[PDB]
Amino acid sequence: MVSSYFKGILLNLDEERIEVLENKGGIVEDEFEGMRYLRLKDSARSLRRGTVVFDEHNIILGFPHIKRVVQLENGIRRAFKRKPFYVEEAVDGYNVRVAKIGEKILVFTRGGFVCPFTTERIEDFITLDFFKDYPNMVLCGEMAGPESPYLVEGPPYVKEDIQFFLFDIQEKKTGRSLPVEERLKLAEEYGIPSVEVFGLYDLSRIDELHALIDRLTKEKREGIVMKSPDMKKIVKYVTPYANINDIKIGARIFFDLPHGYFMQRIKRLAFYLAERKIRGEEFDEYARALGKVLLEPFVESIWDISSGDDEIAELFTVRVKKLETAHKMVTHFERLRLKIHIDDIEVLDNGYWRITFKRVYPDATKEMRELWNGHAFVD
Among 304, 314, 343, 367, binds Na ion (CB under 5 A): 304
Say whether 352 sits in a helix, a strand or coil: coil
Q: Which secondary-structure segment (H or E) carries 317? A: strand 313-320
Q: 347 forms bridges with which residues in the sheet? A: 353
- Kindly state whether residue 258 participates in binding Mg ion, applying the rule CB under 5 A: no
Site for Na ion in 306-335 (CB under 5 A): 307-308
DSSP state of 229: T
- Specify burial of residue 16 (Cβ count, 10 A radius: 0-12, 13-18, 19+): exposed
d(CA 76, CA 80): 6
Residue type, 120: E
Q: Is 92 in the site for Mg ion (CB under 5 A)?
A: yes
The C-alpha atoms of residue 152 and residue 106 are separated, in whole angstroms, by 24
Binding map of Mg ion across residues 102-141, x = CB under 5 A, - = no contact: ----------------------------------------
Amino acid making up residue 360: V
Stretch in the footprint of Mg ion (CB under 5 A) among 31-39, 61-69, 143-151, 323-331: 143-151
Q: Which is nearer to Mg ion, 148 or 170 (CB)?
A: 148
DSSP 26-42: SEEEEEETTEEEEEESS
Least Cβ distance, residue 220 to a copy of itself (angstroms)? 20
When the beta carbons of 65 and 335 are compared against a copy of itself, the nearer one is: 65
In the bound complex, what is the minimum distance in angstroms from residue 183's beta carbon to Mg ion? Answer: 24
C-alpha to C-alpha distance for 295 and 169, rounded to whole angstroms: 41
Total binding residues toward a copy of itself, as defined by CB under 8 A: 56
- Specify whether the CB–CB gap between 72 and 273 falls below 8 A: no
203 conformational bin, left if phi > 0, alpha if psi -120 to 50, beta if neither:
alpha
> What gap in Å lies between CA 70 and CA 57, rounded to an integer?
39
Instruction: Tell me how far apart the alpha carbons of residues 196 and 213 are, in angstroms, rounded to a whole number.
Output: 14
Could you say whether residue 113 binds a copy of itself (CB under 8 A)? Answer: no
Q: Which of 84, 146, 179, 229 binds Mg ion (CB under 5 A)?
A: 146
Min. distance of Cβ 293 from a copy of itself in angstroms?
9
DSSP 228: -
Distance separating alpha carbons of residues 318 and 77, to the nearest angstrom: 42
Query: Would the CA dihedral through 15, 16, 21, 23 be positive or negative?
Result: positive
Which of a copy of itself, Na ion, Mg ion, none lies near 75, with the C-beta cut-off 5 to 8 A by kind? a copy of itself
- Answer with the entry of Mg ion, a copy of itself, Na ion, none that 299 interacts with (C-beta below 5 to 8 A by kind): a copy of itself
Q: Which is nearer to a copy of itself, 134 or 286 (CB)?
A: 286
By CB under 8 A, name the one of 17, 77, 210, 354 that touches a copy of itself. 77
Closest to Mg ion by CB, 22 vs 246, is 246
Q: What x-and-dash track marks residues 262-301 binding a copy of itself by CB under 8 A?
A: xxx-xx-xxx-xx--------xx-xxxxxxx-xxx-xx--
In the complex, least distance from residue 150 CB atom to a copy of itself, rounded to whole angstroms: 16
**Residue 42 and residue 26 in contact, taking contact as beta carbons nearer than 8 Å:** yes
Q: Give the x-and-dash track for 213-252 against a copy of itself (CB under 8 A).
A: ----------------------x-----------------
Cα(44)–Cα(238) distance, integer angstroms: 30
76 binds, options a copy of itself, Mg ion, Na ion, none, Cβ within 5 to 8 A by partner type:
a copy of itself
Using CB under 5 A, list all residues that contact Na ion.
Answer: 304, 307-308
Using CB under 5 A, list all residues that contact Mg ion.
Answer: 92, 146, 246, 304, 307-308, 310, 316
